[PDB]
């Protein structure tokens, strides 16, 4: 679970 993976979760569901 990379940092890029979660940041994409945060941006896409913000």
């Amino acid at each position, epitope marked *: 679970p990379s940092k*890029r*993976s979660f940041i994409e979760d945060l941006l896409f569901n913000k």
Partner: antibody
Amino acid sequence: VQLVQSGGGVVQPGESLRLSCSGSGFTFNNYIMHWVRQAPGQGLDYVSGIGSDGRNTNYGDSVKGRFTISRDNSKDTLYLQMTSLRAEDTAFYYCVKGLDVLRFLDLSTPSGERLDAFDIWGQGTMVTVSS
Amino acid sequence: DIVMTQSPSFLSASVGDRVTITCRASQGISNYLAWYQQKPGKAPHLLIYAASTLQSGVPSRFSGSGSGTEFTLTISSLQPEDFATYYCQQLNSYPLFTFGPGTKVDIER
């Protein structure tokens, strides 16, 4: 370094079409990838975007529920699956390399010599939907 | 989403003229704005990001300004390759982005 598009053509309304966008020269697995379409004589309109891992997707309201974006990182290729196509979907479709989210600061506070986003575009693909 | 407007839609200038293009955002986007150039038969290519920051390889004659709602793209002296259509792009909602309708610059006569 390029984005090479394949597919497209003339289809009847209600049929399905698949667009492919193959990348080379950049680390495909790092960047969000996007699809943009330009209707004849019109502006650029947002279609869909996919996260680097592929778990996250967003869509334009006009295509939601009808369009599906997908990526195969093992082949450095982006896909757009178009179903229940309408005449309004007639446009020239572009794939664009998006941002690696680790450099999100560059959008508001540039840190490097360049912005590593929206720097590579596909050649474009014509999609005409007509009976 | 955020609606971007551009005035004017069409613009005429001579080579060696100063061109200023305006972009307006329906809501505050801070400096989350980029500018693009599209020529017929080609994909748009990035000129400016973060409202005022020049993308690498882009000539110094292009400059951008503004924060919040109102934004400006300035070409200090139009060059023969500059005749084209210019779009602004809000990046505030990234990964979602929307473009302005565009300003087309043709040669004055």
